Design a binder for these strands. Structure first.
Lengths: 81, 94, 97, 92, 93, 90, 80, 77
DNA sequence: CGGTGCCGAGGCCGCTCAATTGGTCGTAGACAGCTCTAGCACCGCTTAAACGCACGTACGCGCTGTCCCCCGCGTTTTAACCGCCAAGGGGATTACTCCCTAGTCTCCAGGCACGTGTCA
DNA sequence: TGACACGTGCCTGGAGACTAGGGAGTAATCCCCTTGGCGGTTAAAACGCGGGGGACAGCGCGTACGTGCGTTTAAGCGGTGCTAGAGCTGTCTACGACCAATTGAGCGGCCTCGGCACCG
């Protein structure tokens, strides 16, 4: 699907950080946080896909994603478990 | 009107709410493109993509509050890539 | 009858015993372990509900939503320490600057 | 199913009778109860296996709760659990 | 545990060295910890799939989860070689 | 022995027994404490080679826990695998 | 035992800092790091003494301390 | 690599904390040594992080604010 | 603050399946007894580590000017999105079985400990 | 001088062969949910321009910290002895797994209703 890390638009990052607590954001923050988000997404999706490969499935389930997130110490509650 | 007094209002109106901040379709395309290089021709449950979005959003919000901590500690209000790098280095993720 | 009524617990002793046995945490499970576990779970859940209800009353809403649960969890120091590595879905953050 | 929805509603009515839960809140709190149960069970099992014991009785769960819930909340939960065990033992 | 099983490995890799008592007592603990981690991951995966057994598939996925691609692929290759060698030996009896 | 048929210096046995005594699941398959033994043998052959290299660098020959800590902390993958680990007298 | 937190003396904290990689030390670092060390000791010791109490043992052993460390998140190798 | 905290003061400290927790307790030397090693490792890691914080703020000394920030970012408080 | 609409939460009945109840038993663990490790308390010497100042300067912190780079805001583009539909791929169930792992009788042979020669 | 390699001997767990039963492998089968497409519409992102504020660098002050040296001290050392209690064995009994029969507590279907959102 070519590239889609640009799908996290600059206003989206701005609103995310603004909810975080910041009040001024430097121009170079956007590329760094896009890289950080891509790294974290790769880390979580690799585990959530190895879980599916184990289950001999072809559809990544919410249970797979929540198990992958739990394995990294970032538990998620609203989606079963 | 002047630079400021609008970022604070945005913080007030965005910390109170809980709606998703990353557009759903671009994030769906992003997770699809990331997962397509591990296993080819995959399918994603809608709840699975939503859970991924709600986890990444929370993680990014936490990282941004930590990087604001770092920026304030350096006698600055503007967060810069050095702040994010230091926050991720201290957190141990690296 | 039952074991929830015997111990005066709202929570189900039999169900938590079944969860203990199914999870395979040890080869054998004692008789007092499910009763104790139901008691502590009931107390912790009652505490969380009370805090979330206080938050909802403060917010002037009679329906409890995950935002109120997140507020209750991250407003009390003990709950925050116990559940600091947890992201409640549609939970948000408590307003601070 | 395996969910504590009715128990959460019952305890809310006991504590805050004027309120009412929602399905999302029920789901997240069910997951929270399951996670706390798993944590306490794993700690008690590890303690039991530490002392060459292949059983997880009230002593192991009590120590797991005390060792997993530091502070005043841990003392209150331990007192509540001991009260429940004593009340159960009173049916004799 | 695993006392001479490290000296045997050290005999074929970096010959002419030896393992001290403290090094042995650290490495056997490390091996036990890694084995426990992989075994717990395999058990959790099997329980998630609703299977009550640990087979080659479970451990394969457990070491894929623990060791990422740069090394987990090498460990997976080594384990597959060992499993297929055992199977070929058992084929002819 | 099954270590004879396998190409394993690490014992296929004494790992099946450890799995059974650890109660990681109700039953353990046949190939599990062979794949696991091979993985452990690789994860020891590496680490041992690195510690030997460190000892040769320090001209000490004998392997000391300091060498093990250097081996673990001097490679990115092993650092990620064992990051919350403190080695005694290292 | 009274006022035994002073056993972690100032040169010991300074040497720990030098091993950590710092180059200069501010005077108020010592009280803060003594407090940090006291908090860490309290947590680990509470876990260890609960471990011994479960085993009905009056002597804390290396296995209990390493179990407490592993639980807290800093696994320890070389003692069991 | 050698032990930095003196053995006897640390032993007395850990005994004081334990007797605060549970009275009439005994410590075998292996447990005290393990605790000392863990505390040394934790403190050197904390000082690494605080040196990073100090360098970040255009400083070479570490101040109590640096330790507090390092602890708060690490999560423990 | 008041008027209107929407729908998910609440309450009553069917019921069924998971929780109770009762009897068996064979083992895991409670309990008593005993030995010997090693934990604790103390004796004194010595010396390495801590402790107390003096001090000269490295450096943290405040002040000030700049110039540039984010913020606000208006406008245009553009892609989310919400509503709806077609299609089928794969999640999820279920019956048969068959092969694999639990369990048990040997049987020894690799594993562990020890004595001795030899080198780090 | 302590530790590794080569005989020497003991020893108990891995292993071979067998039995037994059940875990799940496998083949159909249903239909839920996911993907792809169409289309208006419209909220939001992209772009540009003016401007203010603030990040950064230079400069000066003054303060507090690392270094050195003399003095104090208590850690570490090595015995010495006393005894708590860890660990082990022996054993015996209480209990949790197991199974068969029973039943009522909570789940789902269906009808009510007020809380939440929207606008004026």
């Amino acid at each position: 699907l070519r590239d889609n890390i640009q799908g996290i638009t600059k206003p989206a990052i701005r609103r995310l950080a603004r909810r975080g607590g910041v009040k001024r954001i430097s121009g170079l923050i956007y590329e760094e946080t896009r890289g950080v988000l891509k790294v974290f997404l790769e880390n979580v999706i690799r585990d959530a896909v190895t879980y599916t490969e184990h289950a001999k499935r072809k559809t990544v389930t919410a249970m797979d994603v929540v198990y992958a997130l739990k394995r990294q110490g970032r538990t998620l509650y609203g989606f079963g478990g | 009107y002047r630079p400021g007094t609008v970022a604070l209002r945005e913080i007030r109106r965005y910390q109170k709410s809980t709606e998703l901040l990353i557009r759903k379709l671009p994030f769906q395309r992003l997770v699809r493109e990331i997962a397509q290089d591990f296993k080819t021709d995959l399918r994603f449950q809608s709840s699975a993509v939503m859970a991924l979005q709600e986890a990444c959003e929370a993680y990014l919000v936490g990282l941004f509050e930590d990087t604001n901590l770092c920026a304030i500690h350096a006698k600055r209000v503007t967060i810069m890539p050095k702040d994010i790098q230091l926050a991720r280095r201290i957190r141990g993720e690296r | 009858k039952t074991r929830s009524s015997r111990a005066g617990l709202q929570f189900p002793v039999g169900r938590v015993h079944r969860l203990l046995r199914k999870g395979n945490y040890s080869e054998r499970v004692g008789a007092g372990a499910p009763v104790y576990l139901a008691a502590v779970l009931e107390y912790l859940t009652a505490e969380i509900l009370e805090l979330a209800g206080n938050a909802a009353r403060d917010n002037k809403k009679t329906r409890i939503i995950p935002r109120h649960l997140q507020l209750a969890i991250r407003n009390d120091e003990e709950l925050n320490k116990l559940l600091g590595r947890v992201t409640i879905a549609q939970g948000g953050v408590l307003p601070n600057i | 199913g395996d969910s504590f929805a009715t128990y959460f509603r019952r305890v809310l009515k006991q504590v805050h009778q004027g309120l009412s839960l929602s399905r999302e809140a029920v789901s997240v709190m069910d997951s929270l109860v399951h996670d706390i149960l798993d944590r306490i069970a794993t700690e008690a099992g590890r303690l039991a296996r530490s002392t060459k014991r292949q059983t997880i009785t009230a002593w192991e769960t009590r120590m797991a709760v005390r060792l997993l819930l530091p502070g005043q909340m841990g003392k209150l939960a331990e007192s509540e659990g001991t009260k429940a065990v004593l009340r159960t033992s009173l049916y004799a």
